[model samples]
Target: EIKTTTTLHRVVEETTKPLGATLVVETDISRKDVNGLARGHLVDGIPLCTPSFYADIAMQVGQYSMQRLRGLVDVSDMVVDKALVPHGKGPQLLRTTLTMEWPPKAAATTRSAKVKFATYFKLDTEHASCTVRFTSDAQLKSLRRSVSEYKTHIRQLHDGHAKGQFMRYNRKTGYKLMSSMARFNPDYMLLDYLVLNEAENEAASGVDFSLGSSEGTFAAHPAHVDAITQVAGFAMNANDNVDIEKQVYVNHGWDSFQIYQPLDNSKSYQVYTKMGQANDLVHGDVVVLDGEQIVAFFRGLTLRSVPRGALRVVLQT
Candidate 1:
């Protein structure tokens, strides 16, 4: 028997006219060769990518086209189309087409031209097509201010985390907040207390679970895949065995009232949409949620929530 492997082929078509520039990329990906190792492949840093294979690849290609078109050319329109072909030989193929246009409607001296032509772009983190989840600018400003006011305190805490102060605090306070939190409302202030932990693994096991201890990125998922976290809240746990004890006492953002299993050590978290900019956050962090709106004080990104079908598959296993 011979071994077969997955293959990817991309074709880019560029056309320039007096009006503007257009770019088209046709991607051909063949998953003819996934074995045991390939079975565990984490597309876009997510295990779910495997089940939603074709969609993920299409999004991947879409993002790639934008990365190439963003600063260099302003996209007037974006067209993405995909097709999947399965074979009896146990191989599957994904055919993707991405089309973009950079229309030029202004003179060299216009405001758009001045900024558009003289701009530079870089992405340390991944890109999300649609940001701005449920928060407003005014709310975001207040939230940023609230989190910023604690810069000195957070710095001290960061220092403490580096030196195991969080662990000590957890022990001394019995995982309770030291003071009343009034950032959201005065009525809930006395009852609200934020809990800070060293990390997810450290929180659960008191020691190991090292895999869950490190800060991971959520870029593998959609940017809109967000949760209304707490002062140091994480989204819901993917596990069915939720830790109600660990969740109940923790402080929430402005008007938040849900319980979460803290953040997964293996998964990373984000706050804002822009800085939600490949931003790095620790387990001992905060974000304010006023009802449905989320104000991430930390610099981070966005989430759109996954499709029910996709999530059902991911959660079922």
Candidate 2:
């Protein structure tokens, strides 16, 4: 029941001319003079000049276009309104209003006539507001454009710096640029440098084991415990490389044996080397180490996939 034709302008011209509809060319007007009035020289008490009539012509063309397009389809109750007023000191200004019945086959066909209706309740302030509505399916597309323009207008209220602060993408390295705020924030610094490094160490060592409840409790073999205690104590006292003690602790945890290191503040750093494996020994499962000890074990964690020499973490406050 719907017919489509190419060369819409020609079709529109042909279809509308027979009905006495006029197509007027749209004109561009300077923003400053859009609603201004003109006064000119007079002769014989009559004005002898051409007046600026851009607003009137523009509205006429708009109304004519809508009427012509609407005529292509079967519809009823078509309405159009246009008005003009001076820049200021006027009860009425230039306006156009349009209304039309929905085409019969609009739901079944893509071809639909749309008329946009817009009117301003007031227009004296720096910012003016208006209510607008559109009739017909074609007007829905215009509504979408209007929505996009509204979003852009709303965005103008924000400062430029807030809008522009976002990460850039590096295609080659596949890294997203981070905000400068993140680089300077203390909490971010701690997680990136301190906690993350500890996690890596715990993962790499694979030695923070714990005994499961399904498995029997850790039982310390007396001889093995003696040797481990001796080695652990010696490392703590001498502040020397304690590979022997570290090995002892690793084996104790593997066998699900209890291994204890008496806490000493002076030797706490050394004790961490032995007791850090306590979670493994007692629980027989790898454990994520605490944050303070993670800082001690790994000097710092570095973010990979970043620019090769860019320092992501600096310890200074």
Candidate 3:
């Protein structure tokens, strides 16, 4: 019979401790606040964690979960930050800033902005990073209006392009300019458009259709798989185009998505996929590479399964 004590000992050594370079976060949000919030218990006073620390924690947790669950899921690594500003009373309204760092680069570029607590839970929520600066609430309002106007202008421009109206102008140049303008003022252009459209609809029928509360529970179910995948930077999708190998359980009381693939194909042709119930994955999903050639997948929560010969083809490609 297998020795239970030996298995337990190995499990403790491998799974119980935090791995990798421990990131020291000096945030105003103390251990107390994190623990309380994690427990779903509301604290009376404002709990503070510096924006950097908050971001670090969010990234770490996300990365860890994904790495732990490698083959079974596919998750894109992303960096996220948090800012809390007081509005009325109670706990300072929390604003979590999310930055998606596309692969082959380390530095971060702003992907989305002004993601209020209300829009955080939606899986398909698209954040648009804008270039417009707003130092005060009044500026923010004006910027919003300007963004709406710009959106209308862009739509017209898109139509013009389709209709070949700007035949004299360099088509590529005009498209580039329009794209640049939209990118710089994404919040004002895109998000403002969504808000205005909703408001217009509401005015017609006296029915408000704003996004839900940000301080609410996540839409996903909490499973070890989800937790592990999220920490590893993997997201869940019901339908994925790629093949997957492994799966894991995430028990973190919230659902998330994740995925993984091998860097080297010569060793084993495998691809992995997985989904978590809630809290399965952790940060530091490992991707074994031979000079950028994906070899194998690691991370228990993010991905658990692998295809028979996928890894080999991945390395070849």
Candidate 4:
């Protein structure tokens, strides 16, 4: 059994902002403690965890439950800071900032609300599998826009890229430049995009998508595996994809989409608009885009620390 200690910094009054709380979660991941390393559930030598883990716990919290928030919370503006201590004296430390929110009560709702939290981790410990210390510090307001509006904005960005207009966080253009310079495929798609405030340049980030070519990458299957895998390979960039073990996942198709971004300019991330219809496809906590859900796997980055893996670990472990 995992030991979790929670602290609400302030009372949740249903009528305020900056409401925050902290969570200290402890669990025995003995199964993952290999060669004295906190090797979390690994597929193709990659640690795997999911967002539902955190969402489940987030909802169970007094504030979240009181606010009647349910389902997988939308996460954005995620930033990771840590030293490259492949092996160290202390537990591996990981800190995560998540701008999380529920799907607006219903469509046509002008604004969506979200909260930001910093999650710290102590992994491969002597006492437990890991210890997580997470807390919220602020609540943000979101402005809703139609998919067409978002598409136009993206197209304008493409035009700017075509004209060599470089100076700001035009995600599509910026990424195109990086992909070319880095010699990687420049065929990634925009799964989702975020802007903290409507002002010309407040803060922003774009979620690019990819999927593992191998199989059963995530230790636990995302909620809707069959439907989710059909949309893989949207970018058609086989060079940039996740590498999972070949055998373990043969029983089922590769299902989960990977979310990663080359650049993150926003601190408080919120999904302003995603590439999808209202009722396209539901995969775990998010709605898979009608066109595709992009995922590009990195070999070195710790998998468990990523937003998707972190959120899923809470329940699966």
Candidate 5:
């Protein structure tokens, strides 16, 4: 399991106003007061940090029971730093463990092996500063190292260009080391964009949309499989491919009329998003991947972590 905290000297900061009469802040629908990260099950952004909104997660992994999920985490007494503020809890801390296996569906494919990683955060709302870490089980020690090798491979490819940049931490050792780190889960769609760069900044980072040619090259749920593979020429989706994958995913919960952005630079590969509406869709996609091929599925839940057993029908059928 991965570990993270908020009480640490995760950050130090200074508050200043241009002339004692000014302030600056923003979000799409979130003003500075109530803003942190927008929802949509953000990968590495605001929604996750807003303790008031999802303290259920904290409770789940803590002293609360599945029955108390509805109590809403009682953010009134919960406190977090000032800068990296959440609705209430303000991202006091987080611990995550996500696992992925290589060589699967969609254009986001071609992996050396399975990858297990953790994304942790500690927000300092008052200081607007914080500490974060991404620890992964990539075999050779660190996630940073794994990403380096992967990055080298991408840099050597024909369409391997990327738009994002990796961050570095100054170690007393003298060299600036690349760190899989972020602070307070900034609203920049942190995880999405971070991986976006890590994954070759491939077309749209799976955000800008259009009809796509590749199918099943990435390892994700079929719903996600459908989401990425549907990237078409411009912002237009290949309705045909959409139809193909939508056979079992009729309720895609898409805007249907939302004008998606254009993604010319993106290769439309190596992307991720919430797997589906119902958690069941996530499991379905897992079985599908197993049917195709995988080392072992990674699952870290606030509740019981059930192994995909071989009792038959559901596990590895």
Candidate 6:
């Protein structure tokens, strides 16, 4: 039973919309093709490929006749005798090719074969979507091309089973992680220039302790190192001159270990002799002196503390 339809007016498609697509189908059989017995896509008032349909001499629509039945010799054998035929006799015509092979196209044909709606899409029609895990399709396409070569692996890349063993969490691993913070500010003149600009002492200078600095520039804060002049020095009382001969350490090299501090008042000072700065002056520079002018200069030299690396200068020469 043939239907009513046949189209496709030769204007080959594809003039747009593409970039990701796939699908194809094919089937073929040949017998010296080019208008042989089986080939498709034809319909224009079809009498099905003609030349007066194999020059019909009868036996129906676009015909070609040759017939016979029971045990070959008798069974209405196209009523023999066709105006004395041609032959030294080798096939006195007797045919019976009742052929058919399970819908293998154009079978016992007479105008009707269309039946081609193939399809697929079973995604989870359940037959065993895993009762004991099993996967294929090139093993999930080689596990998505081996996880795109770990495009930056970040921890968990799991889910396994060799003799059966797994540790979850691989719902297609991670990506992207941070940022959306910052803005509180509180500058009190940058906290007083990071706590009072290097505790200024003429904004700093002097270190050369016979030199050593491959980049240890502590090099700041060293009021004076290795310096001497007007050697008989003994001037003090910037805030308390009380004039005691302005402290005459009895002259000459005036007590070598000196302590001339008061330029800005280390609150009164005059150690007539000094030795600190990295030399560890016991808990630093006699621990901020003036313990009562150091008990009034050890009661004019009768001290109670001045022994380690001793010094009781009354030097004059």
Top-TM-score candidate index: 1
lDDT tens readout by residue for model 3, 1-317? 11121001111112222222121112222223232222211112322221122222343333333343221222222222221322223332222332222233312321211211111212212211111111123422433344444344434444554676422223233223233111111111111111111111110000111211112121111121121122222222111322223232111211212222321112222122222333323332222222222332323323323232442233233
Model 2 C-alpha lDDT per residue in residues 133-174, reported as the tens digit of each score? 212434333333444443332233222224653211122111
Ranking by TM-score: 1, 4, 5, 3, 2, 6
Model 6 is weakest, by summed lDDT over 10 consecutive residues, at 187-196
Alpha-carbon lDDT of model 5? 0.21
Candidate 5 per-residue lDDT, tens place, 259-312, comes to: 012222232233222122123221111101111122111121111111222111
List per-prediction Cα lDDT, in the order shown. Answer: 0.26, 0.21, 0.23, 0.25, 0.21, 0.15
On the 0 to 100 scale, the lDDT of residue 198 in model 3 is: 16
> In candidate 1, which residue ranges exceed 4 Å CA deviation?
1-8, 18-21, 26-47, 50-99, 102-300, 304-310, 313-317
User: Judged by lDDT relative to the true structure, which candidate is superior, 1 or 5?
Assistant: 1
Task: Please give the lDDT score at residue 101 for candidate 1.
Answer: 32
lDDT of 4 by residue, 1-317 (tens): 11132212222223322333232332222223321222212322333222322222232332243343322222222212221122323433322122223234432221223333233253322210111212222111111123344345545654554576523334454334333211211212232332322222212234443311111222112212211221121111111222221101111111222232212212112222121111212111222222122222111111121223433343244
lDDT of 6: 0.15
Ranking by lDDT: 1, 4, 3, 5, 2, 6
Question: For model 1, where is the 10-residue window of minimal lDDT?
Answer: 111-120
Among residues 3 or more apart in sequence or in different chains, the pairs in candidate 2 whose N, CA or C atoms overlap within 3 Å are: 208-286, 209-280, 209-285, 210-283, 210-284, 210-285, 211-283, 211-284
- Candidate 5 deviant stretches above 4 angstroms: 1-32, 35-142, 156-240, 243-317
How many backbone clashes does every candidate have?
14, 8, 126, 14, 28, 4
Looking at model 6, the pairs that clash are 257-273, 257-274, 258-273, 258-274
Clash count for candidate 6 is 4
User: Cα RMSD (Å) per model?
Assistant: 15.8, 34.6, 23.1, 16.6, 21.6, 52.6
> What is the TM-score (0 to 1) of candidate 2?
0.16
